[PDB]
Design a protein around this ligand. Structure first.
Ligand SMILES: *[C@@H]1O[C@H](CO)[C@@H](O[C@@H]2O[C@H](CO)[C@@H](O[C@@H]3O[C@H](CO[C@H]4O[C@H](CO)[C@@H](O)[C@H](O)[C@@H]4O)[C@@H](O)[C@H](O[C@H]4O[C@H](CO)[C@@H](O)[C@H](O)[C@@H]4O)[C@@H]3O)[C@H](O)[C@H]2NC(C)=O)[C@H](O)[C@H]1NC(C)=O
Lengths: 52, 48
């Protein structure tokens, strides 16, 4: 038996899937700084974030 | 740009002068910074 122990590099996944979702969550948080009198804006933020 | 808009909206109806000033400054700063970055990037990556 010849065996290999492979450790997966993570940088690609940081560039591809982790950073985008973090940024999308920050975007979601932006909603709380918009006056709660505006409905279209906040719902736009939330729905767009969910779909993204 | 989005955070700048959020700040402007936050300061609107409380300090309209500040919001207008920051919007006016951004209208110039953002394009100029983007153009400078593009120039630097293309210069440093087209000459290697
Ligand atoms: C990747 O995946 C593979 C597959 O699982 C791993 O391969 C295993 O490697 C380990 C060690 O590297 C193997 O274990 C070895 O077994 C030998 C034979 O075992 C006999 O003796 C034991 C009791 O000691 C009985 O229970 C068994 O039934 C056999 O009769 C041992 O001789 C080896 O050394 C042991 O004894 C010496 C005595 O001096 C000690 O110094 C050692 O520390 C150790 O205790 C060792 O135990 C195992 O069998 C392999 N798997 C298979 C399926 O065979 C790879 O290790 C893993 N990692 C990598 C990097 O590839």
């Amino acid at each position: 038996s010849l065996s290999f122990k492979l450790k997966r590099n993570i940088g690609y996944f940081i560039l591809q899937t982790y950073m985008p979702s973090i940024l999308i969550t920050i975007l979601s948080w932006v909603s709380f700084w918009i006056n709660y009198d505006a409905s279209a804006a906040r719902v736009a933020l939330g729905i767009t974030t969910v779909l993204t | 740009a989005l955070i700048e808009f959020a700040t402007v909206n936050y300061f609107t109806k409380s300090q309209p002068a500040r919001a207008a000033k920051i919007d006016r400054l951004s209208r110039i700063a953002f394009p100029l910074l983007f153009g400078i970055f593009n120039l630097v990037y293309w210069a440093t990556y087209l000459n290697r």
